[PDB]
Design a protein around this ligand. Structure first.
Ligand SMILES: Nc1nc2c(ncn2[C@@H]2O[C@H](COP(=O)(O)OP(=O)(O)O)[C@@H](O)[C@H]2O)c(=O)[nH]1
Lengths: 97, 370, 44
C-alpha cells in the first residue's frame, strides 16, 4: 500500500515538479524573475505601491519576463502583503505565498 | 536585455563566424537558421532565427559557406575609411538598436595587428561613447609597423571600452603545437571560439547570480583604468581537479605580481557539496597570491551544459602580470621611434599608456590607496 | 453667447474631474484613466 501510495504521488500528481517549481519562484533560483520583480518594485521608492492595482499586477507583468514558467504551476502566486508601511532603511515587508 | 555583436577586419569576421557555428550548435538550431525537433533562453543573442550580427573579402566565402541563411595596412587609413562611411554604416546600428527591446551591451570582436579593422575598431569606440552613453561595450581584442597599429588602438581601448578580454596569438600557438601538434588560422580559432562560447554560459542559461553582463564585470574591474582581463579553459574528475589545473601558467591565454579577482565558471553536473572543500585546499597550499590591501577573494558559480551536445570549466582573472605584455609593445615603439602632418597623436598615445603601466605597478603595493 | 461657452467649460470640466476621482478609487477599471488622459493632463 505504502509503495503504491508514494508512487501515486510522483507519476500522477507530480510532487517532484512542485518542489523544483516553488524553488524557481520563492527561493528566487530562476534569474530574470527576481532581477525583474525586485527591479520593478525598487523603481518606485506609502499610499501608492500598496493598492491591489499595482502590486497585484506587477507580478502578472513579471512572469512574462521570466522566460520560464507560464504553466499551471506558475499560477497561484498570490503577491500579497502583511503590513501597512507609514514612510533610508533596509526593510520593505512583503510576502509571496 | 539583448546583446549585439560587431566583427571587424579579417580576424574578427573569421573567429566570429566559428563563434556563430559553435553557439548555433549549442542550441537545436540547424545551419539553415531553422529550429529542429530534437529551458535555454535563446532570445539574448537571436531575434525571431536571426542572429544580431554586423559584418564589416572573406565575406564572400562566408556567404558561400552553408551558413548563408544566418544573417590598406596603416592605422590612419583604417581611421579614414571609418570617417568616409560615418552615416552609411551607422544606420544599421540604430535600426538594430531601437528595434531591439532593451540594449545591454556591445560585443566587439576585432584584431589590432595593423589591419584596416584595427583603425576601424578605433573609430567605432569613439562614436559608441558619443551616441549611446548608457550602453556597455565589451571587446575580445587579439594581440600579435605592427608596433605602431598595436600601441595606437590601446589609447582608445583604455578610455572607451569598459572591459576587455586579451588573447595573444603567441601563447595560443604554444598550446597548438603542444596539445594539438599542428607542426593554421582555422586551427587555433577552434579553441578561441570555445573560450567565448563558455564566457557567456551564465547569460544564455538563467542562474541565480550574474544574470546580466553588468553582473560579471562589476566585481572584477575595480577602477575604470585597471580594466583588463585574461581567460582560462581547462578541459582540453572533481572540482579540485578543475581549479588546480586552471591556475597553471601553461593554460593561461597570455604570454611583485598578484591577482585582484578571479571568476571560475563550472558547466558540469558535479556534486556541489565539495566546492567549498576545493576552496580550502587552494587556500592552505597557497597556490595563488592576492592583493594585500583589500580583502580579495575567488568566486565560483554553476550552470548546465547544452543537453544536446564530462566536466568543463572557465577561469576569468584580472592579473597585474598583463602589464608585462604592454612593456614588450611600447619598448618596440621607442626603438622604432629612433629608426623610422604633425605626428602629435602618436605622442599622447604613448603618453597615456605609460600612465596605465604606472597604474598597474602601483596596485601591487600595500599602500595603493592615495 | 461668448459668456455661455466659458460657462460650459467650468461646468463640464468640473463634471469630468468627478469621474476620474471615482474611477481611481478601487482595488480594467484602472487602465481607463490612462485612456482619458495621455499627456499628463488633468493632473489636478
Ligand atoms: N588570433 C587570430 N588572428 C588572426 C586570424 N586571422 C588573422 N589574424 C590576424 O590578423 C592580422 C592580419 O590582418 P588583415 O586581415 O590583413 O587586416 P584587414 O586586411 O584590414 O582585415 C594578422 O596579423 C593576424 O595576426 C585568426 O584566425 N586568429
Amino acid at each position: 500500500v505504502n509503495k503504491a501510495a508514494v508512487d501515486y504521488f510522483f507519476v500522477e500528481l507530480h510532487l517532484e515538479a512542485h518542489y523544483e517549481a516553488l524553488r524557481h519562484f520563492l527561493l528566487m533560483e530562476d534569474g530574470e524573475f527576481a532581477q525583474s520583480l525586485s527591479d520593478l518594485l525598487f523603481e518606485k521608492l506609502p499610499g501608492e505601491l500598496l493598492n491591489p492595482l499595482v502590486l497585484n499586477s506587477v507580478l502578472s507583468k513579471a512572469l512574462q519576463c521570466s522566460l520560464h514558467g507560464d504553466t499551471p504551476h506558475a499560477s497561484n502566486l498570490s503577491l500579497a502583503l502583511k503590513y501597512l508601511p507609514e514612510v533610508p532603511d533596509v526593510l520593505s515587508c512583503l510576502e509571496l505565498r | 536585455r539583448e546583446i549585439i555583436t560587431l566583427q571587424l577586419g579579417q580576424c574578427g569576421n573569421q573567429i566570429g563566424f566559428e563563434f556563430w557555428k559553435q553557439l548555433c550548435a549549442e542550441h537545436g538550431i540547424s545551419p539553415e537558421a531553422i529550429v529542429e525537433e530534437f529551458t535555454d533562453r535563446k532570445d539574448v543573442f537571436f531575434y525571431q532565427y536571426i542572429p544580431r550580427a554586423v559584418l564589416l573579402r572573406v565575406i564572400h566565402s562566408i556567404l558561400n559557406s552553408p551558413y548563408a541563411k544566418l544573417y590598406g595596412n596603416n592605422w590612419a587609413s583604417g581611421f579614414s575609411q571609418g570617417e568616409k562611411i560615418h552615416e552609411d554604416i551607422f544606420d544599421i546600428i540604430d535600426r538594430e538598436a531601437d528595434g531591439s527591446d532593451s540594449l545591454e551591451g556591445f560585443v566587439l570582436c576585432h584584431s589590432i595587428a595593423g589591419g584596416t579593422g584595427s583603425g576601424l575598431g578605433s573609430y567605432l569606440l569613439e562614436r559608441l561613447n558619443d551616441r549611446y552613453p548608457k550602453k556597455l561595450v565589451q571587446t575580445y581584442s587579439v594581440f600579435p609597423v605592427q608596433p605602431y597599429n598595436s600601441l595606437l588602438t590601446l589609447k582608445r581601448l583604455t578610455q572607451n571600452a569598459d572591459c576587455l578580454v586579451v588573447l595573444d596569438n603567441t601563447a595560443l600557438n604554444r598550446i597548438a603545437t603542444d596539445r594539438l601538434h599542428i607542426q593554421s588560422f582555422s586551427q587555433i580559432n577552434q579553441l578561441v571560439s570555445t573560450i567565448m562560447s563558455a564566457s557567456t554560459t551564465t547569460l544564455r542559461y538563467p542562474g541565480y547570480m550574474n544574470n546580466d553582463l553588468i553582473g560579471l564585470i562589476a566585481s572584477l574591474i575595480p577602477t575604470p583604468r585597471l580594466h583588463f582581463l585574461m581567460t582560462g579553459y581547462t578541459p582540453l574528475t572533481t572540482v579540485l581537479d578543475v581549479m588546480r589545473r586552471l591556475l597553471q601558467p601553461k593554460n593561461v591565454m597570455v604570454s611583485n605580481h598578484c591577482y585582484i579577482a578571479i571568476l571560475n565558471i563550472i558547466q558540469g553536473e558535479v556534486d556541489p557539496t565539495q566546492v567549498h572543500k576545493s576552496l580550502q585546499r587552494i587556500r592552505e597550499r597557497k597556490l595563488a597570491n592576492f592583493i594585500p590591501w583589500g580583502p580579495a577573494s575567488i568566486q565560483v558559480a554553476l550552470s548546465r551544459k547544452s543537453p544536446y551536445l564530462r566536466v568543463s570549466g572557465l577561469m576569468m582573472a584580472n592579473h597585474t602580470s598583463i602589464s608585462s605584455l604592454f612593456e614588450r609593445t611600447c619598448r618596440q615603439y621607442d626603438k622604432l621611434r629612433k629608426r623610422e602632418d604633425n605626428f602629435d597623436e602618436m605622442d599622447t598615445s604613448r603618453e597615456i599608456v605609460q600612465q596605465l603601466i604606472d597604474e598597474y605597478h602601483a596596485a601591487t603595493r600595500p599602500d595603493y590607496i592615495s | 453667447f461668448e459668456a455661455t461657452i466659458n460657462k460650459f467649460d467650468k461646468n463640464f470640466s468640473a463634471h469630468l474631474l468627478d469621474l476620474l476621482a471615482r474611477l481611481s478609487i478601487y482595488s480594467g477599471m484602472a487602465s481607463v484613466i490612462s485612456r482619458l488622459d495621455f499627456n499628463g493632463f488633468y493632473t489636478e
